[PDB]
Protein: alpha-glucosidase
Amino acid sequence: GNLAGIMHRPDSEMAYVVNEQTVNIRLRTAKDDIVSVELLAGDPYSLRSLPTDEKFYQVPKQMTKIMSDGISDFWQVTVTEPKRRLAYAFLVTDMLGIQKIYSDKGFFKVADADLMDMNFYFRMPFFQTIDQYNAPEWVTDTVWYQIFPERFANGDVSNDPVGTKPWDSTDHPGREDFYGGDLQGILDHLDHLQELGISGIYLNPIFQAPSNHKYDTQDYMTVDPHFGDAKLFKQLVQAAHERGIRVMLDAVFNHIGDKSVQWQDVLKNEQASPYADWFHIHQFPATYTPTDNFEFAADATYDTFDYTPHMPKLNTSNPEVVDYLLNIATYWVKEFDIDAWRLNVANEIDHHFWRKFHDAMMALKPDFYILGEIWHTSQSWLVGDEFTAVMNYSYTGAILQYFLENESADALVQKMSHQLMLYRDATNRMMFNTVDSHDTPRLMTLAHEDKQLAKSILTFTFMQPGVPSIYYGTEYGMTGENDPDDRKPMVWQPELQDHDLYDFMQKLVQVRRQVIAKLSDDKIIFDVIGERQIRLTREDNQTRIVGVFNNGTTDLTVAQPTSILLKTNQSETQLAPNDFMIWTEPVR
Amino acid sequence: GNLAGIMHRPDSEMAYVVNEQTVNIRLRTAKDDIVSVELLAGDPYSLRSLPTDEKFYQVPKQMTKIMSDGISDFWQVTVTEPKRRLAYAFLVTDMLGIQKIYSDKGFFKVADADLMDMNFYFRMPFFQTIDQYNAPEWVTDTVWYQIFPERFANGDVSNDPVGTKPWDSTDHPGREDFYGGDLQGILDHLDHLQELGISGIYLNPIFQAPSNHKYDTQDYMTVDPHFGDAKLFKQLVQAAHERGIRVMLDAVFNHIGDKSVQWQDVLKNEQASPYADWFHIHQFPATYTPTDNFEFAADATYDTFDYTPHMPKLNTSNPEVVDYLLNIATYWVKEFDIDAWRLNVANEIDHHFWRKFHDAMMALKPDFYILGEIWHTSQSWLVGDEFTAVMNYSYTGAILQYFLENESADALVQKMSHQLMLYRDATNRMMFNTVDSHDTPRLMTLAHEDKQLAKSILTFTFMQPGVPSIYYGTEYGMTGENDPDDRKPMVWQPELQDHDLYDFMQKLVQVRRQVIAKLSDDKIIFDVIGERQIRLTREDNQTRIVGVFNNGTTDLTVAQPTSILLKTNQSETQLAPNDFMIWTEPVR
Ligand SMILES: OC[C@H]1O[C@H](O[C@H]2[C@H](O)[C@@H](O)[C@@H](O)O[C@@H]2CO)[C@H](O)[C@@H](O)[C@@H]1O
Ligand SMILES: OC[C@H]1O[C@H](O[C@H]2[C@H](O)[C@@H](O)[C@@H](O)O[C@@H]2CO)[C@H](O)[C@@H](O)[C@@H]1O
Ligand SMILES: [Ca+2]
Ligand SMILES: [Ca+2]
Structure:
């Protein structure tokens, strides 16, 4: 009995409200150390207040071992209680047959447990739906497409910045290059987006900013003049909505650009500036020593994003900053009807501000989607009062490491199970899955131009619980290393486009939207069936979707499925190295 | 290497902000499984952005094993970072000499760790003081006195309820008895309170309510007429403040009494009532089947506290209820200058309301003290955005179980260490310690009238990090079983008072306020020196307070201290069973 490996944290992802009378409860144990876990649960007041001789601890509820991360096992159970008050404890039995009760009071023999004392148990005191996590349903049926607007399509040469280069997808872009992409180009290629089958557009920042990336905001209340104007953006949003495509914008609230009005005021008036307290200035005047790298300063007298002097950090604890940012976030939603906000460097802004932001957005749109850009563990931002989800960088990163390196299938399945057990079930369905972006090398480059490997990575990711996204140009096999090489002008020429990959992407998106998205309360199972061989199963009460991935150096034979949805090998039974097959079957 | 017993939860009690540039970080391991833990910590951006060859992971920080609960060991370290951004990982070495790195990515050999990737580490993204827990300093120097107003002192026979019984401390009170205690009696005995040395008064509810306990509120905006009026309560608060005594009131917001205006409106107008949505009514009309027990109904059509039909539960998610309760809480503080709120059944009210309540109170008084009445684990209410502390029922309950039963000293020390490791350090100093109350048997009754045992329990509790409280009459040795027997009229007669215990209580309070309260950032150590023998040490840089408690069946000899503060045996070296000795010594 590895008692040190057993843990339950109440009022957490291990004990949360699903609906008015229902809760989900989890227990962590040491891997393969516990053979069974039962839950003793009921109304805490029923023990001594009800005249009945029956007590809730006399009818245990069996828990199911749902996941394992190589170190711990994870058990779960769902409990319904009409009184909406729950006290609970765990009955754990290990390999040697040693059984103990685990409660808020610790570990006991069942004979020594004070089961009649309501304060012996862990507690969910009252099922508070106002405190619970809620997931917007529409996100479940979405496949996103990420657009870096400067490089997607130039629909208007008239607004091009000075020195705009000729549109060349084969170019290796420089850090300060401009190609002239704008909102009119996105409006022009909405038909390509709809033919691909995507139902959501994620835009990198489009607010006035001097750079090609626009993360150094100059004015949050105005669309960049090179990109277009307010009327054109409203037209774009309405056309997207007409095509059944939702819109998500990028909010850069952790820092502002140095060319912004507030910062220039700070540079002119120093401490006498009204915006001095909008920033984190250690010493006046706000200064820094320039270096050869434009994005690096070693001795700035003010806090900044990374070590770049051009992005002074905003003081989100200042009430004036709070009001300003909330007004911006409310303005874009209320005036242009956007569907989601993507929060840049969301982890470096305080929870207090995010709580206010969540309240404002939900007061505007109850089904709003708040996505946080965080690379590490975000349990504190996904309780239900702040973000809906975060970018699932660790999940897709583990997937990429498995497919590109020679790691065992067990390692990948353990990493994915750890990730899933970090959060609530619905939160897991809201996580944002992308294999590359404007900050990482392109998938085709990562796969060393191995198309089959890229198809396998994309299919494996699209089968995951989170919502998938396609970085612009992935559907045509665009290559590139890290930024700025991952921001090449979009390949609009047919001679340079991979049409086979585009056809495959259309089929993959169709499988995601017509099959995996229509599963009802599906369960996910990871099975390691051999060295670098994985069987993924998503299963609801009526239908089951199975995908087998052969990433070994040998052929793999499977029983012939009756209805194959997607496969790369011509055979219906044999899988060569890097092949995969997806099929569907009724539950029996 | 028991890897399953090792856990760090970021942005928790295991990783929190102490001040603008300082954080505390904890690690849990399996007991006696890990021989050492180092912390690798630094600015996450410094790894690849600074041109230096020096990296923060090359200079580890040693962690100290601070606590152990019999199952796990708890290590802690304090880290200062001028950039106010922290990435960190743990270097753990077990009994066999196996060393591994533990990060947000899992467990690795140091050779296989991607130490140059900032996303490999756990993260405190930016030190947010607006999100941090703050403890009001004055609480550290307080010793509370809890008054059940109906039974403390009758200062006015004119306001006595009908059928008020003659004041008799030897009576066994009935559930619906009245003795006539009021606010004028508290005003009359403030001198007794000041002579005892207490600096805080905790009052049970004084708002208009029909019962002797007043937890079935009729009107929150008015002092009960039997108790007094607004002018008398203002006089009481100002006299207490004049004597250096703070005032804490009892807020019963989870439920309202059935004689209240809102409930009577619901009983008259049913669903047409404007207050229908202020409650949790499952079926109209709101009804129940009466039983022989006035406080029990098996089939009420509305949610209530416990199973009593007279306390319908308030719907704290309704904005009108939120506004009403916030107005009440603001009114008593702003108009009468009370110093603290004690929140009745605080766990059954949602976090959203408590966040609003905290914000309102702190906007009124930055040093306000919010105490939650919760019997189980309250990690979710003590993050710093809701309560300051909770009633420390589990801690004092473990102490009582040790002193009254024959449990080993190891068990008590493990329970106390588990409790301390559940929360932040400052939170531990804010917890409210009382050995009995109006809901539990009196200490003298629990000790079977063994005065020495009661003195030992009280001294041991007063040496703990939390703030101590004295239930009225404890200083005179009042007896009684559970409520209503624990609510006997206060013993004002000298022939029935234990003067020896009163003298001892004065000395104990003086030791707490003049010595233990003046320790600066003191450290607490539990040492088991023998079967049922405990050495408690509180130690700052300059002074150290030691207390030895002999709870065995044999004599214990100690070296003669130079400055004894408190002892029960006449010898300065020998401790007989149930004896204890407290002394002080300089740190060397
Ligand atoms: O000038 C620094 C940096 O700014 C942008 O980087 C973004 C990044 O793209 C976002 O995903 C997030 O991590 O915040 C960063 C700062 O806002 C540019 O994209 C990048 O090229 C540039 O170096
Ligand atoms: O009528 C039920 C009950 O009401 C009060 O109990 C309080 C208790 O004293 C508080 O500490 C807290 O737990 O909430 C309870 C309900 O407000 C009376 O004190 C008790 O005698 C009575 O039975
Ligand atoms: Ca253009
Ligand atoms: Ca009276």
